[PDB]
């Protein structure tokens, strides 16, 4: 391959926290960021820092009057903040905290100025890690997420792209994505994700598309902990599949680190590899790549992880040693850069695996 | 000062009183006030209101019969209730406690929801039946598929639908998880019990006390055009006793004119 | 043939009920409610498990848009909500008709997490407060660097600051100060590298704390069904089980001899168990003291004798059937688990043992300061000594007791990287073992048809009446309800077959 | 005072309970078919085939007293919390052209239908007569029969999903956390 | 309506009372089947000779001591449905008015 990859990141994405017990915490962008510097990888990539987007770029996709309330809406003000709070679903799973809107604009700039470079060919990889908010849906903070700066990401690719294709692997499905082009046929999203009484609830097998976007939306039900070689087993032969027959000019890929091997909310059992397996084969078609960054809670597997994959993508192999990061004590014991994935009993049988490949298949069957 | 609306019986937003306590959502009030407007002052409930104002213990009878007065000659069967409306407070509506009686299928949530008779490492034992001590065969696969302790990897797990008790694998049907949170699971061998055909919409009736229902049996046995309430073997609601032979004679002669339509 | 089709899905649904809802289907079907595609799925789902009466149905009637479950469809109404930024292609491009919203997909119930362990937890909690330190550190040093950059243009991105003046002036005075630095600049630079300093110490300390914690917790998190076996295994490793195992492969191949199947291809895990055995037998306090070298002869006996690997190596360090009652079954069971134990951990011995001597460490920070010398110090992290053996002496030793279970199971863990968590119980099923011999033995029947056994073996050349008679015998040393184990094993391949006659002799 | 209501009508009554509650559909308003215009209609129908003077000019004043009682009690008896949500919404629209609000000309043929359900725990807690309360309970029951006759084009098996004129409308998420949350 | 450990709904005069059944009488084997079963009448158990070839039912009732235990046939056992709650009910109210007239 050999790619030119452009990067992006802002020194204040690690400066925004959120509530004291959540989840969600950006500073594991930094540590990340930190990995890819001190490995010298900074000299194979474009750096850069985005501006941050504005309100009329948000109202794009979301309304104007959820941009407004989110330029406004502060831990002082929120008190006399009742009905937003409830109608856009602002509370305590999306909670507010000091840099709220900053970090949104961060995150949107960011992506839409990758889009940007994708578009005028700047680059044929662009990364953003601090986007990949796949769960809020226009008008409601959702997932911890607040903006789906991914829609517009594809907007403005389809801005130059005919067909763009969106793959979410995180262990939650892509349900703000997926609904943001359930009825158009340009964009495909195909999510790998767990389903059953999980959060997102959605991505169920039976969800094709409707209206025009019939047959132009993938959903790949799983059971808990699959492991890398079943991973990529139910990986590869679909997006073999849909590269052969929808063929999209450009795609877009959601790297959450939440389906890691001993994520703090994560079920599933892939290692470092496992996950890397996907990027290599995703890297494999040569259609420009614009890599976000989604789930993922446990900082420290996905620090590595990312910076794994950047090394991965500039088509080279990281050391497995640190290079002496400024967080060393966040890596573990041996101080390594991998994830080990646990000794857990994956329920995914062939048989079940076997019929979502043949359902999968039969739908695509109509889709040259 | 009440934890629920004095209208929905719920919590949350509370516009209480002073001069009676009760609480009332924002929404659960007659006209629905904005909160964010806030009257800003002494606001009573309806029932307060009438009491301050009208209720003089012997004058009361003096407006009503005023009311009255200015509505007999008008409309007066509904005078007195016209009047008397006035004086409560508004209310949730709900269902007068007969017609769901009327269905015993039905039965009401915590907060006055609609419920019906769908609302609901390695484990071995989960394919043994324990009352019999046999094992769970599989409608589809004729297996239990234990699998063992030593190879925990070939067991297949099982659901043993909630309606028929027939047991299940999770692989002969494509299916990723247990239902264990949200209805009952039913599996694959239940009538629909609701139709789209090309559109047109049909659907069963639903489940009635047996002393309301009135069972029917026709006398052709070979053509009679029913619904789907039939038995196999407000008069409006009649079950058919549908003599299962008419069954076959009614699919046969179905399909010979299926056959036909496209034939001749 | 066709007028005899509703017996033949009679008698293959087997049941009323089914056939109450598969008998209300088709009349649903004949009252021109369900359509085709509805009725073929039906009977798909009811007589589809057959090729041939499915098939009948299909060519017989001449079978030769679609919504989602998880979205819903909002009216025209709820369309038109000004967005100040969509562009038209935007409005053809995106979609606001179809939501999920997963709480309407979730039944309103909820969801279902996942089970953590309470290492998980702690793991967790430390880095909860490692991220709360280097948060507070980072804004800190943002906002100090910011300040120089101030103070040093003054001597002659917009909340950080102000939310870190607050933090530090948390009387409320930052309020007014920060509007003060607006119009004293470097008395707050200086307060805050004075709490950088104290933050940067208690981080140090904290640090040292959070790694001491930290070090004998993560390999334990990791171990799932670890921590669970040992406990599992022992309610798991039950003759109730097996045979519960047995009836269900024999029920299920009864609905289309060799029900169990087992391959032993290693020689030396023969006496990698006869060793821990004897260690296990002589050190146990609970036989006689002519007990446990009686114990020692049957189990040489009966391995020299069943594989007749040899009958003296033992001690330095044609088909052939066998009728078996449950004692001997589960005994055989037995001496099968551990086998295939052992067979698993020797198999990866060898790329276990190379990654252990290939085990480098990082030289930054790591041996400048910092080293796990926990089970160096004892021995049990496998320098050289190949896994297999070093494996075999330290289940010697924990037989013996002179190691307590922990540091068997860290070590396990941290050596074989948690793929050797189902040899925590190999004291207890090898004492179940020797348990299941002593029964063996001190029983008259089982005797009985253990020398059976010992004379169908050892003659090797019998006539065509050698099933017969040998199963006759060991009913006649039996009694009318306990099952049989046919437990066959021919010396050209070492495979051994079990089939489950229960009650067939009769 | 014992009420008979079809079974039909029961079982729409029971539908209804749970769209708006379990299904969280509010009606789409305005309807089509309204309480005004099918009093009209009743009334219409009823009073031509009728030629006694005192029972046609009793259905005039029964028809005027129902809507005028309807008109009085939507707003306070007959909506479910859901609803209010779309009830305020429709207040703050008629008040936005200093209009008066008439629900017979919005609602129709089943906030009338449920009207008459909770007649009999109205009743009790008046002071009126009993044949008074027999001849309105007579009247009711007679609408009610004229309705049944007329009931396979006031109730009719429309899906939102597949039909915008269905009688629900799937309401949004935001519209939902608002209605049951205050 | 009739099983073992079932509900049933068993006449006693102008009244009914609820109990479950525990035993299940075949006639023609003079046999009756427990829960905790083929076996013979036992020692201490036994049915009247005119529901002793009827079939009969053990039954315990509910709101009474286990030592009102009873054997009652199909005449006085009905099935357990909405007629019969509803029937029970009946005579409760009658058994109310009754006992209002004797009062006042
Ligand atoms: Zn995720
Ligand atoms: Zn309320
Ligand atoms: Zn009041
Ligand atoms: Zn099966
Ligand atoms: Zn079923």
Not at chain 1, 110 to 122: D, H, Q, W
Not at chain 1, 141 to 163: M, Q, T, W
Not at chain 4, 153 to 178: H, I, W
Request: charged share 25%.
């Amino acid at each position: 391959d050999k790619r030119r990859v452009a990067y992006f990141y802002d020194a204040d994405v690690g400066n925004y926290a959120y509530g004291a017990g959540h989840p969600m915490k950006p500073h594991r962008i930094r540590m990340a960021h930190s990995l890819i510097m001190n490995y010298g990888l900074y000299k194979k990539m474009e750096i850069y820092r985005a501006k941050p987007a504005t309100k009329q770029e948000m109202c794009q996709f979301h309304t104007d009057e959820y941009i407004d309330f989110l330029s406004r809406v502060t831990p002082d003000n929120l008190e006399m903040f009742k009905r937003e709070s409830v109608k856009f679903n602002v509370g305590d799973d999306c909670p507010v905290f000091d840099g709220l809107y900053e970090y949104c604009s961060i995150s949107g700039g960011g992506s839409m100025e990758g889009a940007a470079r994708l578009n005028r060919g700047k680059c044929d990889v662009a990364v953003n890690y601090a986007g990949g908010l796949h769960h809020a849906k226009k008008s409601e903070a959702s997932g911890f997420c607040y903006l789906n700066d991914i829609v517009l990401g594809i907007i403005e690719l389809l801005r130059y792209h005919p067909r763009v294709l969106y793959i979410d692997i995180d262990v939650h499905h892509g349900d703000g994505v997926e609904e943001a082009f359930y009825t158009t046929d340009r964009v495909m999203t195909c999510s790998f994700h767990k389903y059953g009484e999980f959060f997102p609830g959605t991505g169920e097998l039976r969800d094709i598309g409707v209206g025009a976007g019939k047959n132009y939306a993938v959903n790949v039900p799983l059971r808990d902990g699959i492991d890398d070689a079943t991973y990529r087993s139910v990986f590869e032969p679909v997006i073999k599949k849909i590269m052969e027959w929808y063929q999209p000019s450009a795609v877009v890929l959601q790297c959450g680190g939440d389906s890691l091997s001993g994520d703090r909310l994560g079920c599933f059992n892939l290692s470092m590899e496992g996950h890397a397996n996907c990027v290599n084969y995703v890297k494999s078609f040569g259609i420009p790549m614009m890599v976000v960054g989604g789930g993922g809670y446990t900082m420290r597997n996905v620090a590595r992880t990312w910076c794994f994959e950047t090394g991965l993508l500039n088509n080279v192999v990281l050391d497995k040693d640190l290079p002496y990061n400024e967080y060393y004590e966040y890596y573990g014991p041996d101080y390594k850069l991998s994830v080990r994935p646990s000794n857990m009993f994956n329920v995914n049988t062939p048989e079940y695996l076997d019929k979502v490949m043949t359902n999968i298949f039969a739908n695509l069957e109509n889709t040259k | 000062n009440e934890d629920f609306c004095s209208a929905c019986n719920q919590s949350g937003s509370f516009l209480c009183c002073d001069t009676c306590p009760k609480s009332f959502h924002f929404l659960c009030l007659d006209p629905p006030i904005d909160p964010n407007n806030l009257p800003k002052g002494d606001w009573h409930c309806n029932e307060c209101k009438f009491k301050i104002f009208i209720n003089n213990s012997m004058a009361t009878l003096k407006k009503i019969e005023s009311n009255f007065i200015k509505q007999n000659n008008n409309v007066k069967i509904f005078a007195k209730l016209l009047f008397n409306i006035d004086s409560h407070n508004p209310k949730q509506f709900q269902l007068p406690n007969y017609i769901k009686e009327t269905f015993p299928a039905v039965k009401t949530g915590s907060r006055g929801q609609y419920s019906d008779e769908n609302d609901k490492s390695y484990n071995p034992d989960t394919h043994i039946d324990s009352n019999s001590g046999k094992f769970l065969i599989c409608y589809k696969c004729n297996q239990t598929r234990l699998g063992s302790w030593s190879h925990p990897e070939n067991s297949r797990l099982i659901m043993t639908c909630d309606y028929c008790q027939t047991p299940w694998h999770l692989d002969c049907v494509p299916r990723a998880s247990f239902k264990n949170l949200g209805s009952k699971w039913k599996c694959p061998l239940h009538s629909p019990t609701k139709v789209y055909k090309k559109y047109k919409v049909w659907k069963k009736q639903r489940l009635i006390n047996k002393k309301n229902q009135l069972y029917y049996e026709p006398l052709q046995k070979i053509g009679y055009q029913n619904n789907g309430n039939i038995q196999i073997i407000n008069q409006d609601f009649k079950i058919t006793q549908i003599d299962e032979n008419s069954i076959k004679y009614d699919f046969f002669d179905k399909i010979y004119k299926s056959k036909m339509v496209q034939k001749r | 043939e066709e007028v005899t089709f509703f017996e033949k899905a009679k008698r293959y649904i087997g049941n009323k009920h089914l056939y109450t809802e598969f008998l209300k289907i088709l009349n649903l079907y004949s009252q021109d409610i369900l359509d085709l595609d509805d009725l073929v799925e039906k009977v798909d789902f009811y007589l589809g498990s057959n090729k041939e009466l499915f098939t009948w149905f299909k060519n017989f009637v001449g079978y030769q848009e679609a919504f989602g479950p998880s979205y819903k469809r909002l009216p025209k109404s709820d369309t038109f909500m000004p967005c100040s930024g969509r562009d038209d292609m935007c409005w053809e491009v995106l979609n606001d008709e179809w939501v999920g919203h997963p709480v309407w997909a979730s039944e309103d119930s909820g969801f279902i997490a996942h089970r953590k362990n309470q290492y998980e937890e702690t793991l967790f909690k430390i880095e909860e407060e490692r991220h709360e330190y280097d948060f507070y550190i980072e804004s800190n040093l943002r906002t100090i660097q910011c300040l120089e950059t101030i103070v040093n243009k003054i001597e002659n991105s917009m909340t950080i600051y102000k939310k870190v003046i607050r933090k530090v002036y948390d009387k409320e005075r930052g309020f007014e100060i920060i509007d003060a630095l607006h119009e004293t600049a470097p008395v707050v630079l200086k307060r805050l590298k004075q709490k950088d300093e104290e933050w940067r110490r208690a981080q140090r300390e904290w640090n040292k704390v959070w790694r001491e914690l930290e070090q004998k917790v993560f390999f334990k998190s990791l171990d799932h069904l670890g921590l669970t076996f040992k406990q599992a295994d022992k309610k798991l490793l039950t003759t109730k089980q097996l045979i519960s195992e047995i009836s269900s492969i024999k029920v299920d191949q009864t609905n289309k001899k060799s029900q169990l199947d087992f391959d032993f291809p290693d020689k030396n895990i023969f006496y990698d168990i006869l060793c821990l055995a004897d260690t296990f037998i002589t050190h146990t306090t609970a036989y006689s003291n002519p007990d446990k070298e009686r114990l020692k002869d049957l189990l040489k006996y009966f391995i020299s004798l069943f594989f007749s690997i040899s009958f003296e190596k033992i001690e330095e360090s044609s088909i052939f059937n066998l009728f078996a009652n449950t004692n001997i079954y589960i005994f055989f069971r037995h001496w099968t688990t551990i086998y295939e134990r052992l067979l698993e951990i020797k198999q990866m011995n060898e790329r276990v043992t190379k990654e252990i001597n290939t085990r480098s460490t990082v030289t930054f920070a790591k041996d400048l300061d910092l080293l796990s010398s926990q089970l160096s110090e004892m021995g049990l992290d496998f320098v050289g000594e190949d896994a297999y053996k070093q494996v075999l002496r330290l289940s010697r030793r924990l037989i013996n007791g002179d190691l307590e279970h922990q540091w068997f199971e860290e070590s396990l863990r941290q050596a074989y990287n948690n793929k050797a968590f189902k040899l925590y119980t190999i004291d207890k099923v090898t004492q179940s073992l020797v348990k299941h011999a002593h029964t063996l033995m001190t029983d008259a029947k089982t005797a009985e048809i253990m020398a059976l056994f010992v004379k169908d073996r050892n003659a090797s050349t019998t006539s065509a009446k050698d099933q017969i008679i040998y199963r006759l015998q060991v009913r006649s040393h039996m009694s009318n309800t306990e099952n049989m184990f046919r437990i066959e094993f021919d010396k050209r391949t070492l495979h051994v077959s079990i089939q489950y006659i229960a009650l067939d002799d009769l | 005072i014992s009420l008979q209501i079809p079974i039909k009508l029961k079982s729409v009554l029971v539908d209804d309970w749970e769209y708006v509650t379990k299904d969280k559909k509010i009606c789409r308003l305005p309807a089509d078919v309204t309480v005004e215009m099918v009093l009209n209609k009743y009334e219409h129908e009823v009073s031509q085939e009728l030629e006694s003077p005192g029972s046609q000019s009793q259905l005039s004043e029964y028809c005027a007293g129902l809507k005028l009682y309807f008109d009085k009690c939507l707003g306070n008896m007959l909506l479910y919390r859901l609803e209010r949500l779309q009830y305020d919404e429709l207040l703050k629209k008629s008040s936005k052209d200093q209009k008066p609000l008439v629900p017979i000309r919005i609602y129709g043929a089943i906030h009338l239908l449920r009207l008459i359900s909770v007649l009999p725990e109205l009743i009790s807690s008046t002071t009126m007569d009993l044949q008074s309360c027999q001849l309105l309970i007579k009247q009711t029951e007679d609408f009610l029969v004229w309705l049944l006759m007329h009931v396979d084009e006031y109730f009719n098996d429309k899906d939102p999903n597949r039909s915008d004129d269905a009688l629900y409308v799937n309401t949004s998420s935001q519209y939902e956390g608002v209605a049951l949350g205050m | 309506e009739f099983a073992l450990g079932g509900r049933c709904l068993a006449f006693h005069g102008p009244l009914m009372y609820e109990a479950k059944i525990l035993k299940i009488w075949d006639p023609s084997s003079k046999m009756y089947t427990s829960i905790p079963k083929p076996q013979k009448l036992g020692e201490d158990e036994s049915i009247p000779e005119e529901i002793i070839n009827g079939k009969c039912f053990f039954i315990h009732y509910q709101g009474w001591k286990s030592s009102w235990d009873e054997w009652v046939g199909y005449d006085r056992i009905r099935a357990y449905n909405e007629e019969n709650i509803a029937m029970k009910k009946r005579l409760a109210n009658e058994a109310k008015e009754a006992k209002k007239s004797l009062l006042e």
